[PDB]
């Protein structure tokens, strides 16, 4: 099970989630179960936390192949969070048993995808480039921002979300 | 957890490997080893019933201070398939060059 697109809308008003189940033959029995949204405040390592930001159960929408693909567009202001200074964690679940021929390690019910707003980062890069235009010297804040973004990338791809939030809160919010 | 076990075993094995090669490890790092294995036995014992999720948050965010502190303790690696910017593999398929009253359309 995987993500098709997991993006925040360019208008900074919707959080786009478009999930799908993998096309391989032995997820025929497997479906999509729920969508749980967490922020940098309510995250826990062991799956979604209690009192989450927004829970979604997918039988509610439909009345079986329609249930294998889902698309959500959440008005972020309705979630009562800041679209610019929020890092969303999007969990998904399966509620389904694959066949007995699955190769090992592929049978995992849950996934996760981190989300942030790239507009503030784009504005910071534009500001630093404007500074570079004057006298052709590289500000050190620009290199610091680049390397800290790469640090958060490494933390996310290695799954070390606690230190990822620590860096986010320490550098890209305050 | 089953992972605090692995980190603690790795840390103390590295500690005794250093004491085999050298004859000295900084006690400022022996303190970190002590904290680490004390926490793991705390969480894998009869005192794991007194922890809320806020306590879990605090414990994890305090243990991550020990992650890259010394060579004995390392940043754990989890199975992750995410990133800060994701790829858009959606495909475009309009219906016989049609549009809605305002915009485009697809299958």
């Amino acid at each position: 099970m995987h993500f098709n697109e997991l993006r925040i809308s360019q208008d900074n008003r919707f959080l786009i989630i478009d999930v799908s189940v993998d096309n391989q033959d032995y997820f025929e029995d497997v479906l999509l179960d729920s969508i749980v949204i967490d922020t940098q405040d309510t995250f826990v390592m062991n799956g979604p936390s209690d009192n989450p930001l927004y829970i979604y159960n997918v039988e509610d929408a439909y009345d079986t192949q329609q249930m294998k693909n889902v698309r959500l567009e959440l008005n972020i202001q309705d979630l009562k969070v800041s679209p610019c200074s929020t890092m969303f964690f999007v969990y998904v679940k399966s509620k389904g048993t694959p066949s007995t021929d699955t190769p090992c390690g592929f049978d995992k019910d849950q996934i996760l995808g981190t989300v942030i707003n790239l507009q503030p980062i784009y504005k910071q890069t534009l500001k630093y480039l404007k500074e570079v235009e004057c006298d052709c010297n590289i500000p050190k804040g620009f290199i610091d921002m680049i390397l800290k973004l790469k640090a958060i990338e490494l933390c996310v791809r290695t799954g070390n979300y606690p230190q990822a939030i620590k860096y986010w809160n320490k550098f890209f919010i305050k | 957890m089953d992972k605090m076990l692995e980190i603690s075993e790795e840390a103390i094995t590295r500690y005794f490997t250093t004491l085999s090669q050298f004859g000295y490890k900084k006690y400022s790092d022996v303190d970190k080893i002590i904290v680490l294995f004390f926490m793991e036995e705390m969480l894998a014992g009869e005192m794991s019933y007194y922890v809320t999720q806020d306590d879990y948050r605090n414990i994890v965010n305090a243990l991550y201070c020990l992650a890259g502190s010394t060579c004995m303790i390392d940043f754990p690696m989890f199975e992750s398939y995410d990133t800060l910017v994701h790829s858009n593999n959606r495909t475009f398929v309009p219906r016989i060059t049609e549009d809605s009253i305002l915009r485009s359309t697809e299958d």
């Binding site: 062991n46 209690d50 | 957890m1 089953d2 969480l43 794991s48 019933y49 007194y50 922890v51 809320t52 999720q53 306590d55 879990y56």
Partner: peptide, 19 residues
């Protein structure tokens, strides 16, 4: 794997609901 207090509360409440 790890449990907190709230996890046990959910489990026991869900047991008692269906008994």
């Amino acid at each position: 794997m790890f449990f907190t207090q709230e996890d046990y509360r959910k489990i026991e409440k869900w047991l008692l609901a269906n008994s």
